Amino acid sequence: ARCVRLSAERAKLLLAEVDTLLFNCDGVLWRGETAVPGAPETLRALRARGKRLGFITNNSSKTRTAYAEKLRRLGFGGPVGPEAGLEVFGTAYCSALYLRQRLAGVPDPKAYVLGSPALAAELEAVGVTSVGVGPDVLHGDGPSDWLAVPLEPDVRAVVVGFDPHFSYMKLTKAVRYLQQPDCLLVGTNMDNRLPLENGRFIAGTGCLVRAVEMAAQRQADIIGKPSRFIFDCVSQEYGINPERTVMVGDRLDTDILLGSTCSLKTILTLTGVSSLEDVKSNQESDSMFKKKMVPDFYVDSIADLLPALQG
Amino acid sequence: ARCVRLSAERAKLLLAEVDTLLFNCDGVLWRGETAVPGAPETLRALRARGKRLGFITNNSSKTRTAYAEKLRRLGFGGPVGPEAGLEVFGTAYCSALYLRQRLAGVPDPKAYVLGSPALAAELEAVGVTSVGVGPDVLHGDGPSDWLAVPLEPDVRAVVVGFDPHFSYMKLTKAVRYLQQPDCLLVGTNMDNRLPLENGRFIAGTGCLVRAVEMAAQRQADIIGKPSRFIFDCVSQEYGINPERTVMVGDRLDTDILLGSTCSLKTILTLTGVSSLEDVKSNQESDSMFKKKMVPDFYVDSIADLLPALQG
Ligand SMILES: O=C(Nc1ccccc1C(=O)O)c1ccc(Oc2ccc(C(=O)Nc3ccccc3C(=O)O)cc2)cc1
Ligand SMILES: O=C(Nc1ccccc1C(=O)O)c1ccc(Oc2ccc(C(=O)Nc3ccccc3C(=O)O)cc2)cc1
Ligand SMILES: O=C(Nc1ccccc1C(=O)O)c1ccc(Oc2ccc(C(=O)Nc3ccccc3C(=O)O)cc2)cc1
Ligand SMILES: O=C(Nc1ccccc1C(=O)O)c1ccc(Oc2ccc(C(=O)Nc3ccccc3C(=O)O)cc2)cc1
Ligand SMILES: [K+]
């Protein structure tokens, strides 16, 4: 955990020692719809050497198939056909898995999803009916009118994911549903800001999840990184061996901390949000938790692996 | 800080040593439009005894003048006419004063207010123009469209107050405005829940302010209780003497903590949010901050002061 630059020799040693590599799609492989220069060639070379490539993302907007299509379109060489989805693990699919297990044996389970269409679709495939996907503008002169709005009959969970239609009405409805102790609170991810191309960014799902949490005085179960649950899903379907697996990430609090908590080796790409200066601040601090989110190796871009892989 | 019940004897002695009593309007004096039973008579008796009564509230929805009208309407016996407003101190008015200080020397001052009409009105009286009050529904299929929406040219502050129209578009616009370093971030209050009559509650301004804070990675300046600023505003016009002043409140984290930090004596009314068990948790805990939010006296309702006052 010394944030060593992964030079070609160091990279060759690490690559020989690891037969699986896990990546964060946003900020490592690609930004916006534009690939990080050289990243596609790097991942294709890694597949050529026989290394298993897996993808972990905190984005609830896209399904497994959609993310796989993006990776193939941009030349990261995923398997073609339906099998592609198996390679990518995202908060939407993992949220569906969490609700499948937790609400197992519940008849015709339904949930209030303050989230994207893909999240609702993944839940539907799991069998969880979804309500609340879409706009919910506020109507009423005062609080009583807002609290009077009708609610769906059987809602056993609230899923907070990226919802551009998020409103105070949705927050009030979420609180009302969550007043029942049985009702679960699920947060897709806890990212404060999410990066976009050209150094632009938009507010992160975490802002919504913290708003709902505070309003209901409940602590949500966060499916996404850095929670061990997303790693457990990957481990259930990939059979990950922590000693022989690497996590490539751009965000210290989510990706790198996932690696540290789950005993995976960590590579930090500076293409994305986090910076070497942030690592230095965490290193200097005496807090052990801050020390956890310190990467084993750092690369300017994933493309810096190409010299070793082009061997 | 032993949370002793305010018996009639204790009340008479305490009233003898204190010549000013400050109250929280919501949850102590009244809930909704329904007054706490006997409270109007208590405050009227305090006026008759000569005790100076002042009001501090975290609600940005209501103007100073409107709160005064509520006080006379419900029989709490404030001075009639314009001077009524002098008695009430609220987050809207205090926020306007804060912006008067910070935006002093600014031509045509403007702010993006995620808030009520009353908040904008108080700002307007101070001279600060308001933008964004009202619905701003999100339209557009993706992030680029949302960030392309035009913004007003001159915004030197963003004020996050209770906004029933809060939406992701308003959060994005607030983030964009706060990206300029000069732009200030002001939060009217930081309450997670606000109480309503009938034991129901809705989400608080604090949830919205925390969402904006996280999205902008900025620390908002919180005007409302327990911030020292609201007490300074009260003291500017009242000349508060801590030895002779009491704070009557229903919420430990806001009212009682203001009393402790500003060295005012504290009475807890159980009519509102906080409960004796919460006080017990703070007393038992070894955290010093929890010990700060422990009331000196506790009264079931302010009406239990009437026996001492009817003397
Ligand atoms: O919810 C969306 N749509 C709809 C909802 C209801 C009805 C119709 C639609 C309709 O698109 O017709 C939606 C969701 C997302 C949208 O863009 C985004 C694309 C990508 C991301 C993203 O990088 N996400 C993250 C990445 C890293 C870490 C966290 C996140 C996160 O999202 O928390 C975000 C938004 C557009 C429409
Ligand atoms: O989130 C809160 N609770 C919970 C969340 C999950 C589960 C349980 C609870 C549970 O309280 O059982 C929360 C707690 C307390 C809250 O009041 C507050 C009151 C005042 C302030 C405040 O002025 N703070 C600041 C002061 C000055 C400058 C900046 C700030 C700032 O906060 O930035 C904060 C919270 C609210 C929610
Ligand atoms: O009690 C209230 N507050 C608080 C009390 C204690 C602690 C915290 C808060 C706290 O708000 O954080 C309260 C009272 C009344 C409330 O109804 C409201 C209803 C409507 C609006 C509002 O913007 N309305 C409009 C805005 C734009 C355009 C039109 C309108 C309209 O009403 O036509 C605000 C508050 C909420 C909380
Ligand atoms: O608040 C954040 N920022 C700032 C705000 C103001 C000023 C400066 C900063 C500034 O980062 O300089 C913030 C930082 C990092 C954030 O990622 C996080 C991701 C996840 C969690 C988290 O609890 N993850 C959970 C996982 C499992 C179980 C429970 C939780 C839970 O959240 O309950 C915290 C931070 C977010 C905001
Ligand atoms: K960077």
Author numbering:
A (entry chain B), B (entry chain A): 11 to 321
What does the paper say about this structure?
CP1-bound PGP crystallized in the tetragonal space group P41 with one dimer per asymmetric unit. CP1 binds adjacent to, but not directly into, the PGP active site with one of the benzoic acid moieties (referred to in the following as proximal) at a distance of just below 6 Å from the catalytic Asp34 (Asn34). The proximal benzoic acid moiety of CP1 forms the only direct hydrogen bonds via its carboxylic acid to the nitrogen atom of the carboxamide function of Asn199 and to the side chain hydroxyl group of Thr215. Overall, CP1 is embedded in a cavity that extends from the active site of monomer A towards the dimerization interface with monomer B. One side of this cavity is formed by the more polar residues 35–37, 68–71, 125–127 and 143–145, which originate entirely from monomer A. In contrast, the opposite side is formed by both monomers and is generally more hydrophobic in character. Domain movements were recognized for both subunits of the inhibitor-bound structure only with respect to chains D and E of the apo-structure, thus indicating that both monomers of the CP1-bound structure and the majority of apo-PGP monomers adopt the same conformational state. Despite being in the same conformational state, there are differences between the closed state in the apo and inhibitor bound structures, e.g. the substrate binding loop, rather than moving solely towards the active site, is also translated outwards. This additional movement is needed to create the space required for incorporating CP1. Hence, CP1 appears to inhibit PGP activity by locking it in a cap-closed conformation. Based on the inhibitor-bound structure and the competitive component of PGP inhibition by CP1 (increased KM), it seems likely that CP1 sterically hinders substrate access to the active site. In addition, the cap-closed conformation of CP1-bound PGP will block solvent entry into the enzymatic pocket, and thus prevent the hydrolysis of the phospho-aspartate intermediate during the final catalytic step.
